[PDB]
Design a protein around this nucleic acid. Structure first.
Length: 66
DNA sequence: ATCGACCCTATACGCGGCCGCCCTGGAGAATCCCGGTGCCGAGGCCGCTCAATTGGTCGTAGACAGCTCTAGCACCGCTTAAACGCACGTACGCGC
């Protein structure tokens, strides 16, 4: 349902193959798991154990995602 | 034998001197601007030629309509796995 909302803002009256949604979910979760790996490394580097929004922002800054 | 007076010493204070801490002017580099100079790369013109242009023919990918058949959407109900909220407290964030 979330992806349907995002697509409605791009083009109206769209249908999705069930395999298209599953592929979107696969790449999304893999991106988020990998991001939390980099996020956890940043938090440990700051002599901390708890992840914080500054850790994710630092990770995406190093990746070049602005 | 005892009391008063005098001298000596210890102590307290009194203020003076010295030190440490807290607030402003000014000195000196390092930077920006500026007018003179000067030089070498930019911008321009010259002329050559090869790539763009043009006119033309042949063919096929593609536009288009027609038909069909998968699968994407809608709906619904039952179960329950999972999600939400609240309570507690301990160990982790962070400030020193």
């Amino acid at each position: 349902r979330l992806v349907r909302e995002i697509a409605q803002d791009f083009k109206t009256d769209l249908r999705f193959q069930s395999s298209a949604v599953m592929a979107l979910q696969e790449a999304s979760e893999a991106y988020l798991v990998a991001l939390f790996e980099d996020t956890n490394l940043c938090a440990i580097h700051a002599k901390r154990v708890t992840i914080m929004p500054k850790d994710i922002q630092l990770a995406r800054r190093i990746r070049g995602e602005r």
